[model samples]
Target: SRIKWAIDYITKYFFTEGIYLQKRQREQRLLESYRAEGVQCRLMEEPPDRLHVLDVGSCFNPAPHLEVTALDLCPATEDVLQADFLKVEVVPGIREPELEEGSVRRLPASHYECVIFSLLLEYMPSAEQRLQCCLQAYDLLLPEGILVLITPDGKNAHLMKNWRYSLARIGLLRVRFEKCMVFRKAISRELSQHWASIHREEGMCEEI
Candidate 1:
């Protein structure tokens, strides 16, 4: 009954509250802006009619309009696939992800247009694992793809700045980060790392 309630709540929260629509529109605008700026992306060059979205911790597959691959460690419904986000192997190749015994094993690198991490990072027990998940999300997304994160508002602005710094190091450009909490857009690894280098905090020099 608890799991069922969770599923129902997820649907109502995203669809009934119009959160899904809001995020979708925001993404469209962001993509448009990127295009205007001549941001080249192979997959998005000839955009598909339906977007391919990966919901990493999808409780019940919230967005129905797009092509969503819902994955959960323990799904309340059969439609949601079983997979451990931290354990899933993200490989580079043209081949598709490998599923074994109703669980996802291998995920193709740069395959998804968007990856949702709604209330996912908090669930992770360790900061290391949380960071790892973000790294994996980076690999799974195509260039110019977006990571839609819906974290809680418990973190303050300074804390968020640190998070943004870390993600920039991992090649995700900050889009809009409010406490769906934040959206990080994927970019070229080299470029993002360079960005991080320029933005990094430096220690004050002591006079000899």
Candidate 2:
């Protein structure tokens, strides 16, 4: 099956090759102590026990060890929830996900500890949709949370720079870009807004 092929391929790249382990430890280290612009970021009130992960475009639950909320357009297994990434609504305040017939319609803001976009951005038909995915991911993450993005291995001269600038505008601070790009949310919305203001590019226009 096509889903079977995707599961195998993803497992090989993220698991068999040990990319997942690398990211897991990196996330822990960041959580333990991460500072932006010489200021400490806030974490959850209590010590993290089981990280709450939001796996977007997840064909299958890759990291079953964590408390993962896996959402995909089509479910490869019962563990995966059926939801369209572009359509899911994000609301403020912590609340349970609104599920209709096993599909998620609404999600709580600042609720997830981590959000993964594993080879999902390139699948978007347009640049607008890709940015939308990033925007939604930003809203879903908790303050100081991580956004892990994996894109295809290819060079697009200025594409990465544009992406870095764009995500910075979204209040996602770039942490690393080797193999997978990792970003951390600012400690507060106000902090991110200030960061975005100062980091604005001269020729760049606003994105909706």
Candidate 3:
């Protein structure tokens, strides 16, 4: 199974003994750089008051930020609600909400102080869907409300081509396994469109 294969790979190669030492050093350097004077970073800035965060998917155990409310198809635990974020309400057919749902869409008008979308937008089937999701996020935000998204940059497809090809080959070997090919063209186009819309409407500040 793909899950077993991935688990084996990670256990054996990715996170074996001595890996943490290198990882810790890299992270420590990053932390120092982030805290350095005149270094403009988003997380280093002032924390928001009364933040209403909506995580798009995959709620982890013991979420450090108790304020964050995660929405997903399957409930992780009692605290996790089984809701489709892409639809107005959880319904049949569209099992997993596409993040552009009316309920999700209506959010940014008020209520939430910050929206955290991690690795969710990339699963969108098309550029229009991605753009719509961004537009929804833009509309849902309060004045100066932050929208944080962490996703694989679609523009860097060439750099990841070999890796993707290998993954695809593996998927082919395993009948039940499949890999979602990153639609770099669509993602890049939609991301650009989304950012342009944000810039025009909200005058967003990109904290690199």
The best candidate in terms of lDDT: 2
Tell me the lDDT of model 1 at 98.
83
Deviation of model 2 at 81, angstroms:
0.6
lDDT of 3 by residue, 1-208 (tens): 3223322322321134332233334434644654473222111122243345556655542223225656655556756545555653322233133344322322334334444455556666654565455445544443333344444346532212233222222110111112322211111223224334434433223211
TM-scores of the candidates are 0.69, 0.68, 0.40
List, residue by residue over 176-202, the lDDT tens digit for candidate 2.
555366676655444454456665663
**CA lDDT of each prediction against the hidden true structure:** 0.62, 0.65, 0.37
Ranking by TM-score: 1, 2, 3
For candidate 1, the clash count comes to 0
List model 1 lDDT by residue over 1-208, tens digit each: 3223333433432345543444445545656655576533232343344567778776686644457777889788888888998899999875466898889899888887677775777678766777788899888886666676664444432223446666777867665543353444443454455456555663111101
Off by over 4 Å in 2: 1-43, 63-65, 152-161, 202-208
Better of 1 and 3 by lDDT: 1
- In terms of TM-score, how similar is model 3 to the real structure? 0.40
Model 1 spans > 4 angstroms off: 1-43, 63-65, 94-96, 152-161, 202-208
**Candidate 3 segments whose C-alpha is farther than 4 A from its true place:** 1-48, 59-66, 89-108, 152-208
